[PDB]
Amino acid sequence: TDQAFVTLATNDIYCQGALVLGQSLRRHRLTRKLVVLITPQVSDLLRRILSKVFDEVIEVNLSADYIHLAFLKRPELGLTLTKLHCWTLTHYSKCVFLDADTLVLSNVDELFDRGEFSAAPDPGWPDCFNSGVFVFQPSLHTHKLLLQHAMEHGSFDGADQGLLNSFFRNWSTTDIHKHLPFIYNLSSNTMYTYSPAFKQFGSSAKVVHFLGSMKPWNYKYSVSSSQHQAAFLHLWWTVYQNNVLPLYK
Amino acid sequence: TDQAFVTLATNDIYCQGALVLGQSLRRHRLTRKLVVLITPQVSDLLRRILSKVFDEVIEVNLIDSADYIHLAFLKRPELGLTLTKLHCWTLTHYSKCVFLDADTLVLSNVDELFDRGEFSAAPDPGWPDCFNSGVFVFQPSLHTHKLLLQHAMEHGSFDGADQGLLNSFFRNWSTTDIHKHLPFIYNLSSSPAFKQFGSSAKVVHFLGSMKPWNYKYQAAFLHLWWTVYQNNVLPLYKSVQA
Amino acid sequence: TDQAFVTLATNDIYCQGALVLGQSLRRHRLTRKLVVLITPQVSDLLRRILSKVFDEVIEVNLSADYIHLAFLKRPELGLTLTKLHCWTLTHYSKCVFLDADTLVLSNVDELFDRGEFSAAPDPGWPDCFNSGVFVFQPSLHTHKLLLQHAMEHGSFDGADQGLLNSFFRNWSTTDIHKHLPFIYNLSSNTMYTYSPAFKQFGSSAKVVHFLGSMKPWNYKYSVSSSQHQAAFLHLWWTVYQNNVLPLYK
Amino acid sequence: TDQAFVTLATNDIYCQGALVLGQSLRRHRLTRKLVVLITPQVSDLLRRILSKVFDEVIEVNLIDSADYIHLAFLKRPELGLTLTKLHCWTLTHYSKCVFLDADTLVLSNVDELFDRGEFSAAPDPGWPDCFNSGVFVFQPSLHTHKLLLQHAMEHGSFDGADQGLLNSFFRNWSTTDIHKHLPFIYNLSSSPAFKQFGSSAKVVHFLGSMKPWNYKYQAAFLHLWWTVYQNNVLPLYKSVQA
Ligand SMILES: [Mg+2]
Ligand SMILES: [Mg+2]
Ligand SMILES: [Mg+2]
Ligand SMILES: [Mg+2]
């Protein structure tokens, strides 16, 4: 197929997220390619392990002048621009990007029925999308425009979510079909309290997104944590213990 | 015109909210009628005060209503105030209305909301595939009202309030028509996003059980609320009380 | 019948509570007598109105030496001792006391199947009962013992709940049949937040108890109030507007 | 004897709670075995540390269990940790156990809890016709365990956690046998009542998502927790890490 799931691991620790994400996709009847972007900081060891899960392991480094300039002008956007490398994967016609701190709970192949740029609303400011999960179409032209926009204006939150919301500015007003249902990117903040909405709709979750400074891998050898958050932490570790830990050996 | 802003005051205390809301509407190029729905326990004094702001002060008595309304209240007593709010759909001398809860504040003219069709509302920041029911555009109709009450009798509300019930009834809001998604600035329930877009706020919604009238005179929006209360609401109390 | 519901109104304002309580009982198929205790501070006007609702309107004043001594020794317990006058109503064999800030949502005649001393648990410290609703048996001997206990030791909360829990000290350990289900005395604090328990069980409420400094009658010509609390406030005012307000005229 | 205290550590962080709990039990005339249930993600290092406190360190792997357990987890994935806690009923080499959550602290010997029969628990301060599931007396049995899991598959939990499920299963707790109501001092979830009876507290339960190990070293009970942590838990980390 000419379609893929894409994620990003910027260091050996974050590879744990990518590996769990990757295996969660394989558990639920994988029909697409799996791609992981990495930085030069990812060790040869983790590369061999990643290769047991991902069809492609692609190191992002420095490349054309238009890329160099953005990177050198705005060092703070180094990881953002690394993520945007996903738009250069032009051997795929359509991709779903998933951040390495997400977990797939069910087959989500229906996401490929969506067109660029499709994303779920972000809690807190719901007229912005969360950039942890989105459907895009690789294009060198789009990549150039994104980087020119990054170079020219930067990001209003210093991260990829601000840059992407700024570029795909009409997301909240144009076409409802590019609004992914919230269950395709369910923030782990939403389940800190057992709210009526979460009780009513939470069970239909297809992808969970672990936010906060405390990632799932930080719980294994001081920020508050919920029982219902803990539940999803346990699902993450179930995939890790059963589908990832064996790979390391 | 045949269009109106509509709010609800459920007792004399919450009238403080309705009055501030109403005055904030009158402040910014008033072109529509203003309506406040009230419960029977809203006192005569505050009816007189409300009358200085609102074009219609309409008492909703669920016991003295049509049988289907009376019955809905007896079967779902806990939804009495939700049913009182839903009474807005009985106002069929208006063709289209904008409902604003008494804990909202209008920062500028929002007459363009009447361009929207039923059912239009803004996303809720907690679970954004639900809309927040503090602000919406609707079209009065006895038929819709009856369908709403039938839904309430059969299913109640998953949050025990009007927002659960309205989301359950209008359950295709998050998937159907982007033009029925109000921008968040029309129901701004108050991050990097806030500093970026917060300034363009047109209607703020004070969420939580701690309402502006519970304090004794973020903090920016609260100051705007009290400014209107002191200047445009408190005098009404005094002049009617003389 | 030789059984009655009993409440207490210590001033004209609290009579509003007693009148709503009284009418709520009459709405739901009244089979027992209704009694209201009052103080000398209740006006002739409110007495005539109370008489339209209650079978007995009984003024509590100063009486035997054992009563006088308690009252004069501990002026802070004046209202507590006024409430305890309910135990002198020996022309009834069994009574249900209901505080004037409660509201009956359904016929509760089954409470008379209970024996003294039956009460519902108090939230916060559930090994104490809430004294807003209880089943007791009038007795001059019991009244003497209560007042002697009041005179000797007072109340650990300065109110009737501390005195009564102290006297009926074994409530939490002796016999489950004297534990009234929580729905016979549902605190309005419990519904400040939409807790899972309240969602699950709240609908079966038979008697609601309005606590906090802000009584229902304080809302009509600055403390936080909940939507679900508001719901019960509205039920109180429904009884008031329909069944009490006409009486005043 | 054939009796045990039982707790549950679901990850290395929450192990801090289990260790403090365990040490507080060892402090006050220890007469029973101590057991900690753990999830597979509890690290080897912390298993070694737990082994210095608990007589049994038992890993619960829902995927590698009997089919009815595996299936319950797949049908109710959100109840994974609840099912892990409910695994305490599989410990049939004990005839009776006392379960204590890892966010409790024992202030003195509570061996008299083993006089209680299944199912014994203290009232919950929020809705007191429900018991709080942080402390209870039970009797291990594969039969009860299967009934519990069948209940979980069919009904889930109304609060998404073990307390909803246990109250639904043992739903006659509030009406049946006063001797199965533990006094509140055996699960003191921390008023005039508190000052009066609070001093006799035997087991305190730190409710809320903010646990003792989330702070950086009322306030009285928290001091008691940290005292045990500093003196009796922290050294275990160091000695095993050498
Ligand atoms: Mg992320
Ligand atoms: Mg509101
Ligand atoms: Mg009271
Ligand atoms: Mg707990």
Swiss-Prot record, chains A, C:
Post-translational modification summary for this protein = Self-glycosylated by the transfer of glucose residues from UDP-glucose to itself, forming an alpha-1,4-glycan of around 10 residues attached to Tyr-192.
Q: Which family does it belong to?
A: Belongs to the glycosyltransferase 8 family. Glycogenin subfamily.
The record lists glycosylation at Y192
In UniProt terms, what is the effect of altering G158R? Found in a renal cell carcinoma case; somatic mutation
- Which residues of the entire protein appear here: the answer is 35 to 296 of 501
**Record-listed UDP-alpha-D-glucose binding positions:** 8, 10-11, 14, 74, 83, 99-101, 130-131, 157, 160-161, 212, 215
Tissue expression pattern: Detected in liver (at protein level). Expressed preferentially in liver, heart, and pancreas.
Q: What is this protein called?
A: Glycogenin-2
Per UniProt, subcellular location reads as: Cytoplasm; Nucleus
Q: Where is this site: Important for catalytic activity?
A: K83
Lineage of this protein's species? Eukaryota, Metazoa, Chordata, Craniata, Vertebrata
Q: List ligand-binding residues for UDP.
A: L8, T10, N11, Y14, R74, D99, A100, D101, H209, G212, K215
Report the domain of life of the source organism. Answer: Eukaryota
Subunit relationships? Homodimer, tightly complexed to glycogen synthase.
Protein task: Glycogenin participates in the glycogen biosynthetic process along with glycogen synthase and glycogen branching enzyme. It catalyzes the formation of a short alpha (1,4)-glucosyl chain covalently attached via a glucose 1-O-tyrosyl linkage to internal tyrosine residues and these chains act as primers for the elongation reaction catalyzed by glycogen synthase.
